Amino acid sequence: ERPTFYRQELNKTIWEVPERYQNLSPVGSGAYGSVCAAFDTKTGLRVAVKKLSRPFQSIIHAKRTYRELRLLKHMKHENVIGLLDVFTPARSLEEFNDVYLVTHLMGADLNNIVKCQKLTDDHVQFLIYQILRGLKYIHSADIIHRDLKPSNLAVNEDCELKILDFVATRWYRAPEIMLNWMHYNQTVDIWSVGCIMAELLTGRTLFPGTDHIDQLKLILRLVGTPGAELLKKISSESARNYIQSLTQMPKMNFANVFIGANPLAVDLLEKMLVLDSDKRITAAQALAHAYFAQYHDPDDEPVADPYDQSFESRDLLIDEWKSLTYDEVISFVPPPL
Numbered sequence: 001e002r003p004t005f006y007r008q009e010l011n012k013t014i015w016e017v018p019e020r021y022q023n024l025s026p027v028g029s030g031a032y033g034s035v036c037a038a039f040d041t042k043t044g045l046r047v048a049v050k051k052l053s054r055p056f057q058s059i060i061h062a063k064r065t066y067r068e069l070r071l072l073k074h075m076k077h078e079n080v081i082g083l084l085d086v087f088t089p090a091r092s093l094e095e096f097n098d099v100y101l102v103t104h105l106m107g108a109d110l111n112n113i114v115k116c117q118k119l120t121d122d123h124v125q126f127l128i129y130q131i132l133r134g135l136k137y138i139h140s141a142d143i144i145h146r147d148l149k150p151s152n153l154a155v156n157e158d159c160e161l162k163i164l165d166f167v168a169t170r171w172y173r174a175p176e177i178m179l180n181w182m183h184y185n186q187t188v189d190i191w192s193v194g195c196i197m198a199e200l201l202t203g204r205t206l207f208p209g210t211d212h213i214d215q216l217k218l219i220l221r222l223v224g225t226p227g228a229e230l231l232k233k234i235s236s237e238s239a240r241n242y243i244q245s246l247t248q249m250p251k252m253n254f255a256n257v258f259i260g261a262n263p264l265a266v267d268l269l270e271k272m273l274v275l276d277s278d279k280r281i282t283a284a285q286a287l288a289h290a291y292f293a294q295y296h297d298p299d300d301e302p303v304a305d306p307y308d309q310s311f312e313s314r315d316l317l318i319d320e321w322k323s324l325t326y327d328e329v330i331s332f333v334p335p336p337l
């Protein structure tokens with residue numbers, strides 16, 4: 001321990017952090033960890049501190065901890081959560097048991113901003129622009145988010161947005177994921193963005209499926225049952241039988257479904273909510289869409305440094321994942337103040 005730590009209990013959870021962080025107050029808890037807001041005396045910044053839950057209890061948890069830390073250390077973009085700091089009270093690998101992550105405090109999530117109401121067109125343009133700008137970066141690193149939804153989008157009072165954590169998740173999931181296709185691609189994230197954008201425009205969940213089958217049904221109601229070109233790509237005999245046995249439905253007219261919305265917004269929705277993932281617009285392409293003319297800047301939509309996910313295929317011992325994680329804690333270099 002280079003800095004001096006202090007201990008305290010907050011909601012049954014023990015928090016041991018450096019004295020630079022003051023006035024911890026809980027903001028939320030999950031199965032993966034708990035978060036407190038705090039004041040960083042060194043920078044004058046309000047920060048969020050996340051304490052991971054049982055990070056090395058099993059090989060599974062240990063690998064997930066490593067995965068999360070590696071990802072977070074790599075994400076350096078204005079629209080993606082990143083790290084201000086990472087620390088452990090442990091003085092050596094032997095006593096290493098806890099991991100704390102620090103980032104700039106964000107005020108609320110998009111679900112809170114939606115208030116289940118319609119946002120203005122300018123707000124929809126700026127919020128979706130930011131999601132896509134972050135998604136361009138994430139995708140450029142060969143990372144798929146896979147779980148985009150309003151609760152995973154942090155937003156400040158000035159409408160600044162950051163993507164987090166690479167109500168029901170299924171509502172924003174791509175149809176090919178409902179079908180359990182093993183080879184989905186990055187455009188599953190674009191599907192999610194389309195579902196989010198629709199909700200910001202209408203104030204209603206686009207596809208509020210009660211289960212996976214219902215979710216697919218609702219999707220096909222809007223975009224229609226698969227055409228011949230898409231059917232040819234389905235390997236599963238059972239899946240084809242199921243799909244081809246549904247009463248066929250044509251694609252709805254998006255202009256009528258979203259009547260009143262900016263025609264440019266409607267056009268983009270049409271390009272995002274395409275049933276065949278191979279024909280969906282990419283994040284980079286979407287940024288160039290006329291809907292974002294007021295915000296698009298091709299010279300300020302950066303890509304990420306390459307990201308090595310080779311560790312994902314490795315089968316290591318629990319202490320090996322723990323040691324790799326410890327190395328990542330020790331090697332952390334904070335971003336310039």
Ligand SMILES: CN(C)c1cnc(-c2cccc3ccccc23)c(-c2ccncc2)n1
Nearest residue numbers: 035048049050081101102103104105106151
């Ligand atoms: C599920 N949600 C909404 C989460 C999850 N984790 C963190 C989080 C909280 C604290 C530190 C973090 C470090 C890296 C990545 C995420 C975090 C936050 C958070 C981040 C910034 N401000 C407020 C809250 N929200």
Ligand SMILES: Fc1ccc(-c2n[nH]cc2-c2ccncc2)cc1
Nearest residue numbers: 178179180212213216236238239242
């Ligand atoms: F949403 C989904 C997800 C998967 C299936 C499925 N895949 N293979 C076979 C089927 C299926 C599901 C239900 N009834 C018959 C067949 C059908 C709908």
Ligand SMILES: Fc1ccc(-c2n[nH]cc2-c2ccncc2)cc1
Nearest residue numbers: 175176179181226233234275276277
């Ligand atoms: F009903 C549907 C809904 C979506 C899909 C889908 N869209 N993009 C890719 C596919 C797909 C699904 C299953 N197997 C291969 C590809 C295919 C059938």
